[PDB]
Write an enzyme that holds these catalytic residues in place. Structure first.
Site: not given
Length: 256
Positions: A27, A206
């Site tokens: 994300c 990540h």
């Protein structure tokens, strides 16, 4: 994974909002968008407790589209925009990057790369080879961790140990430097890294908000857990691995 929670933190003079990933996906919007809020490029009603991938998204597009150009990218820019604008909605789900191992600003160009390359935001990763190990420099070269996999599988099949030997000693460099960071990368990262200016850090598919402050590398607290804690604002990347000290905005230590 739909909505996101606002930390509301006194920073650089006034009360500034920030976004907290609890799901912890590949994300990178929370990671970029965060930066813009700090920079105060995007202002949020003091009220706001929450925000959507929808809100966050449209906020970024108006922010990209409000870039007037800086003369590298000339009408090259005008396509850099189109490229990014189009793969913009990608960031909602997630986005793999092909990290290179040459240097900490070295990746295979995704067109999602173009969002950073347009917001004057640097992207860095820690997963560097160690010139303090000769076989890697030769047995990895300028290859990327999507292109090294393709290659290791080719070597496993070549009837020529001349090039299986490499295919082994790449398999080393991953089934060892698994944590996508080396002590070398970490040091070299602080080298490139300008003080006080915010950036983005890639690791294990990540994304993290970053900075160097008093010439050490401190990340942000995108973890939803430490949430009422206004003083709990930056974690450290002082270390290759271990534990980190937490701070308030002004990089003073804090305790639960």
């Amino acid at each position: 994974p739909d909505f996101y929670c606002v930390k509301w933190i006194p920073w650089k003079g006034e009360q500034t909002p920030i976004i907290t990933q609890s799901t912890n996906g590949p994300c990178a919007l929370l990671a970029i968008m965060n930066i813009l809020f700090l920079q105060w490029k995007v202002k949020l009603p003091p009220q706001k407790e929450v925000i959507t991938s929808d809100e966050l998204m449209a906020h970024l597009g108006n922010c990209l589209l409000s870039i007037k150009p800086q003369e590298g990218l000339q009408l090259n820019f005008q396509q850099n925009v189109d490229d990014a604008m189009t793969v913009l909605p990608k960031l909602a789900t997630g986005l793999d990057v092909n990290v290179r191992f040459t240097g900490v600003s070295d990746f295979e160009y995704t067109p999602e790369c173009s969002v950073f390359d347009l917001l004057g935001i640097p992207l860095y990763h820690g997963w560097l080879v160690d010139p303090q190990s000769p076989e890697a420099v030769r047995a990895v070269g300028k290859l990327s961790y999507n292109q090294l996999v393709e290659r290791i599988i080719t070597c496993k099949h070549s009837s020529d140990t001349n090039l299986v030997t490499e295919g082994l000693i790449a398999e080393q460099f991953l089934e060892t430097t698994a944590a996508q960071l080396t002590y070398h990368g970490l040091c070299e990262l602080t080298a490139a890294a300008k003080e006080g200016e915010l950036s983005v850090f890639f690791r294990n598919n990540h994304f993290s908000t970053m900075t160097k402050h008093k010439s050490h590398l401190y990340l942000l607290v995108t973890d939803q857990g430490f949430l009422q804690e206004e003083q709990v604002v930056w974690e450290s990347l002082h270390n290759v691995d271990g534990d980190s000290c937490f701070c308030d905005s002004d990089f003073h230590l804090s305790h639960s």
